[model samples]
Target: GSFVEMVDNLRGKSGQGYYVEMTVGSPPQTLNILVDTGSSNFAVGAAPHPFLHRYYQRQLSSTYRDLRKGVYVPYTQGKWEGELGTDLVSIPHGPNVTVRANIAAITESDKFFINGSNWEGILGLAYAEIARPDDSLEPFFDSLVKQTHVPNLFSLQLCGALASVGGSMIIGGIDHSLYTGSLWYTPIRREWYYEVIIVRVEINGQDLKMDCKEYNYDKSIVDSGTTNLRLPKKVFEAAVKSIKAASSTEKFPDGFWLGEQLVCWQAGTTPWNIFPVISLYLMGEVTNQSFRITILPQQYLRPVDDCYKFAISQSSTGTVMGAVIMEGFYVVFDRARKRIGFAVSACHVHDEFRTAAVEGPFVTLDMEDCGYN
Candidate 1:
């Protein structure tokens, strides 16, 4: 569900391919657009591409206003270049609220689109501080909030996280039925990237035992679009060592953790017991409070082609609690409150074994505080 086997369902699409249908322009051109939290800019394909179903033909939309400007956004995988414009945009994904919104119609791209892509654009749900053309243009959510009079908060339930749905993104409000417990709030350390503070990370239950700052070498985030649960090199190495120590029986291949190959096992059987659960501790509502969100093996490792691929990787940027971490949780982006929320997702189901953990609201009694400065 978290692209655990998107390679199987979606071939050659390296981008995180989760999308929602949005009707753009006065002519009502509907297209699937990616829902991303890592960046800001509501960009859509304006020209015909080999992968997309259709593009927004600017001539057909009478309300479309060309802004006479260009925008380019560079990402870790793909980048898109486009011209800025204004158009009426509405979605069937959530509430039926149409707002005249800023749209970056992509004229060119590098790795942004791929074969078998159901989506032709991307919806960036982060603050506008990281916007390509600059923060002068408000983000889609902000625009939706302002125009539609909806709450300034949104929530995500990913990877069959909904009862019968593949995923759910409830804008302007929370879906109480999607999660099991009360929401645990985490402070948003910075507005640039939905940035949060990762105090520490643990394997199984044992702490990685690194410097408190190691987890936040630069910063951390709670992005729904990231395909992998990425960590800094130092933190990744520490996790590998701890996992190895915890499971000493198996000798994994050298390139396994590097994401070069997959480890296969017999069908109907699993290697779940050979691995350990990963727990990330984040700065909670208070600087002195903390919470732990753990990912079970089921969400992290899936049976793909009778093999298992690692979802965690070494990242150059800050620690990323990406799809892998958010797979079993209902995540909330409370923009007005300047905090993020997490709860066990209703769609999470583990075969044979039970789910791991998600806990917080505990006073952070650490000898050295692990918080963002």
Candidate 2:
């Protein structure tokens, strides 16, 4: 059941939302917070208007404390400037539970930038910014690890219609109900990103051997933020050529772009059909010997004429495999143990956070001859 119907019954009603209020600066300002398992940084809105500050203040309870010396989160975009503090957070959406958390006030941005209709702020799941011998800089999730001793880990299932209720991110600990069995793991690289071994890539239906010489450390990561499948530049050239040979007159969708120095084809064209069943084989004991665990129906694809013509602009390109193909499976990330696991679930709820890798094999064909064996 890779669909929502299956997940709804499995997760039950125990999982809902956790609300938090944070204080930044001296006078104290508070904003509601969404417990985010997807990102590692914590930030709130900052504006230059008193009315905006007052709007967020009303949401805060009387209990507030200064924590500016505890954490300092940086932002590359938008205006940010404020003091840091903490407050008791009461999640009014579900069960009445209050968790004390830090908050940053917004003195200079739009209301949406800080507390929109859906969210007021964010509580990250990484170690606190202030790292200690035992207490890491990542405070929120790490604190949970210290207090609960239940292993600081969480997973996200991002599936269903974009307009649908979507998916849920299970936090505090793993959800035994959603999983079919035990946890598979990979050592978490001490480095910033979650790097894993990429043994090979499946092109069209064939395993295009990786030139062992070309492998490097930059290629491995369990990235959920990306949007489409990406491969090395040379590798992508061969695959895209194979796709064009299969269907030359296909029309690509608008705004099509690949971020890497690689060629990209819209998942929409019949010529681009060869790349449909792509996958990234990890260097470990995969529960399923069959490489093709996730299958996308034709409906998820768009058929366009010029295989090279994409839906989006071309300037946006990068070497990364995103959530587009990692739907419908339960992915396990055991950082402490440094292991990663994958499982096919009857509950087809797609969790982007838990999923990674690509699919397929295709034989390259020259455009002049328009023939491939």
Candidate 3:
């Protein structure tokens, strides 16, 4: 089975968005591949080149079939069409998991490049439903779940503050020792999404009577694929203001930035004495009471640009609920029981440099912002 790796985006290149490096291969080859939890089917590009940093040796033992006749992943950002092949997938210092599948040798365009980091391909866990559309392979997650029953759920705990280890998606069972409380659950929608009832918004201890009807619930996808928290213009505005006010900062001396719908803080030495505390009330009593994670002053929040803004065009509003707030807690997506739950305690796994702020590309579908759209 494939183990977990911590990643941080260095910079965006050739429209590849943020670049990240992670370890893979036997004896721990530090291969830099996109940390994508969005799609579970993992594949990396390989050539007859030497394993300099960290590379995958194309195994001739297994069958490598061209998937040009198989499945298709039509992405909103870009369309990836090719055939699926099978090979021996390796994870550095990890096992040589027998990946009985192949990649859809992207023959279209270069808008999306996977070999920038080190590996040459991608690992997609994003769920897709097709009727005899192509091959007989399953979505990445489905295959992993069936094979490794130990980790039934893929959990992500993205750090709240800027410097904290930005969050992570754990692909296995929950680590009970990391979590301090019981699992609070809400049913999951069968349509490849985790839905949580947004009852009300509370800033600090006061309740903001912001009606949930104003924001489209259908577009809201509780994704482990993304790293930052995303809210519609209305919610994003309100949240930033509330966070600022709570911290008693008279003015944004450091200023705010944007990464999609997120209004981030500019990286600077300015002391924004802000202890941003926010909470989302769910369906049950699983309230995030003392669970309001704090956002450090150093890790600035960036506001989305106008053109790149994810406007809720449906009802003049488009909002995405991402990973920023889900860090440091146990987020349980009980698919079998049809419920999603969140609780405080440390069931989260973050990068070693958890105190640093960084970004990466494509993992959790709607997540992995590839620069301005």
Candidate 4:
């Protein structure tokens, strides 16, 4: 079904998670679920801890069916194992449109970061090939597109730091008003994930070499679920060293950890522009042109207690362009065309590239009144 849902960016507790309101079952039991683009599995009642939101009670719904199948989803923070079933799930449209699809009823979990938090579960947006049990089941989005009069497309407008208006996710179409520039399109390297090739990465106009003999590829996934940008361990270390070498201030030791990585200085202690702009040159095969996505200092630096931390981390494997790098741009996932589109977000304070507006079959969802000059 074609719809637009306003997403909430949870700043308290887990400062990185974004959730959307959705109703499940026949009678419509509402729950706040995290919007994840990294995996393909729709689940609820997954977290073991006592949360503010209610769990998916199968007994309350008349259309709930027991499939007698179990599923186990392992994530970066924890694992969840539970039973799978089909139920009528609906999004909050003018008049709620429901669809019968498979949903996981989580019974057991271990160290799930969403536990005792605001969100109840996760709604994955990735392809089914990357899902559990060798992609036997279809994702919720795939099911929705198949059963309803909707296009195979969705758009995301993620809010920047400290903005009162969180964002909106448009299903089946794009909200042209949320973005300010021309939309750049790139082909998906793999269907399992929203992966793309990084032709080059530059910091302060200098190219940072990431070609290592150990790694076979230089591709990165554009994941909305990920809180921060994660790069290779060696690449991260070299990047940190370069930042320290360019800074004139006293070097701070790397000891404090903020969930993902360590930071050097506190918020007010560090001057503006201390960290250089990180640009990722994404190769758009469909357009036969390369588009650059620039991450500014405000987008990559966050204040944690007395420490001002970098919003990127070092991962053992795989590169992810997470929310930190994505908040500056409006991203579109065109499943039918097998291409992803990007445009400069209206929320961005500075626009160095002077990107143009997007050209496509899209409508303006709302007027921009966030006070961005």
Candidate 5:
């Protein structure tokens, strides 16, 4: 049993974030919820905020069950303080079964729901280990599986610059045709979020040569919600140097990488030509079986209007490869199997650019757990 939906990718000033429609409560209040893999709290706008265009009315929804539990979630740009409850939830594009699910009703939040955003809530597709108010509360996807008897696996395929700019997600099972060739499996180092081990990273075939632990400083995650590839501070600086050194011919200024300014050029001319390919080495299913996936210039150095800007950001700890990386591949989160799978989808293919920049079943490390942290 599986359901697939082509969700909207709301593009604003910063970037495009994917969202899907979900009907909540007895009366069925449909809202576009952000499909986020980073956090595990199915939260929605309950109280009215100037920035929020719409919210769930607590007065309505006869099926709602007030848990009286407080919910407090912190994010990089925003944090929300809300109350928890239970209600019947159904995805218009998902399984026909309507599962009783936990919903965090946001009464107060800052910057979490901005005016530019079209979503009223967030659907936490992550594991229950990261579930807010502790793991005691079951996540929506888990509930869907238990009730609907769908397989405990979901696949994601994000749109690239050349496409229509929306993402397709498959609940329960994967569409074999969505991906090309066999899926490359990587063991999930930890249960929380889609954590994986990055053996190494290279720029234009030149390895960064840093300690392997540096990549997994605290944790490395593949989040669909986050727009850019967030690198640990140290790794971020090193990447900047690597990019500069690799493409020394291009006089790209520091201000561009720091997000202080934009680099504009002739409308017809392309900017990806000036940048170089970045390859990340990930630990595969087998111990020493490490593989490399290349991120072509078109993936990172994206344009907003006529000006091209760096899509990567520096994080305080750990590394997060978001849509920038996920858009390059069709990602699979097999919860029961406890492994993340990747394959380049036909949707992301463009002959002008490199065709599926991924290789190796190479022996990089013989360690027990590459991400021991």
Candidate 6:
């Protein structure tokens, strides 16, 4: 059945992440799980039991079946080793809907960092190709579509960068109200991830002139689980130089580097106006019309104590269109069409200042010459 659920922004050990409500087993043990589009394994409770207020208790669920097979998945920060099983999975959207699906009951977790988090586990939203070996079952959304009349599509509208504003996830269809203008579509270059060809990237209307085909960095994946946009090392350095030049900033604060390439900065010190609007041009093979998604200063700059940190970072692999770039638009993953779509989100055009920016060439007003707000 088609349904929409408002995802909650929960505080994790590191920062804020989005979580959605789901129930598993016959008795309906509900849980708040992280909505991750980056990976595809629905696992829980690898965290220490004392920190796990809610976990998938196999004994409580009548439908739970142990596959007796172990699965291990490693992430950038941590790892999870667990047992694979299947049970009734339900998403309560007005009328509760259920589907029998595979699940990973995590037994051991090392640095899997959900400790003291409000959410219990992760609910991956990607395809089955990314799932673990034993738990490499069909993705949750795929099961939802096959078992029911729901569309093989989903949309995401994350509530800005701040945790205070909540977001919604619509399964089986799109929410017209979440975005504006025509939904621009681009072909998915790969099925493993929501990968698309970034034809070009521009800063302040000046193209980066990147030869994506030559470098094989043209394909970028849209990952909601990541907090910042990640570009290849050289591209990242160039982009940073452009940002520094436009903003007239001497150097990014040393405190910004959190190692493992994660970075942040002081909130108010940086001159946001000096930063130019970053635009990504996505190529649409079907329509031959390029779809543009612009990233504004407000969206890319994360506020901390007294400084605003640039949210773009360097990736060891291909480019990633993370939450920082996604905050400005409503995104739709059309599995049936094998394409993705984007439109300006409400948050980008609601305010007068932002509206002015939306009407112009940029996503945000040119702040360089203007007074500090």
Q: Identify the candidate with maximal TM-score.
A: 5
Instruction: Give the winner by lDDT: 1 or 5.
Output: 5
Q: Rank the candidates by TM-score, best first.
A: 5, 1, 6, 4, 3, 2
Q: Which lDDT tens digits does candidate 6 get at residues 15-39? A: 4567777788989888877878888
Give lDDT: candidate 3, residue 170: 50
Q: Write the per-residue lDDT of candidate 4 for residues 1-373, one digit (tens) a residue.
A: 2233333322223354677778898788888888889889898883435653678888888999998888887877789878988999887741235788889898988776454566788888999898775588889999999898877898887774532326667777876777775888867877988977666566776876655321113446889888788876776777666666655465555642224555654544555555577776665543334666777766777655245667777776467888787778889999999889888887654444433233333221211110012
TM-score of 6: 0.85
Q: For model 1, where is the 10-residue window of minimal lDDT? A: 3-12
TM-score of each: 0.92, 0.58, 0.61, 0.84, 0.93, 0.85
TM-score: the better of candidates 2 and 6: 6
**CA displacement after TM-score superposition, residue 115 of candidate 2 (Å):** 12
> Model 4, which residues run further than 4 Å from truth?
1-16, 46-48, 93-96, 113-116, 162-165, 210-219, 256-270, 286-288, 349-373
For residue 112, model 2's alpha carbon misses the true position, in angstroms, by 9.6
Candidate 6: regions farther than 4 A off: 1-14, 46-48, 134-136, 161-165, 214-219, 249-271, 349-351, 354-373
Candidate 3, residue 138: the lDDT equals: 64
Which whole-number lDDT from 0 to 100 does residue 258 have in model 4?
Answer: 27
Sliding window of 10 residues with minimal summed lDDT for model 5: 4-13
- All candidates' lDDT scores? 0.78, 0.40, 0.42, 0.69, 0.79, 0.68
Error of 3 at 32 (Å): 5.4
Clashes of each: 0, 78, 57, 4, 0, 11
Candidate 1 residue pairs that clash: none
lDDT of 3 by residue, 1-373 (tens): 2234422222233223222343333333344454443454454444433332344443433345444464455655555444445443333322224334344443343334444333345555444442124325565555555655434565544443312233344555454543554666544434333444444455554665555543333345465435455565666666666665777644433233333243333454323334443555444433332122222322223212122222111212234444444444656555556666565645343333333211111122211121112
lDDT of 2 by residue, 1-373 (tens): 1223223311111112333344433245545454443345454554434323333552444676666553333433343335565554432322223445555554444322432233345555444322221233344554445445445455555443312224444443344555554444434434344444444455444665655223222344454433344455666655555444444454433233342222344453333233344454444433222223333322123222223322111112223434443344555555555555555433553233332232222222221121111
Candidate 1 lDDT over 1-373, as tens digits, reads 1212111111113333567778998879988788889888899999988888898899999999989999977867778999999999987656657998999999999988867666788899998899888999888888898888778887877763211226777777776777887788888877889988777778888988788777886778888778778888989998888877887787888688787888887776676777788888777765467888888877776444377777788987878887777778988898999999888888775656668467976666561355446
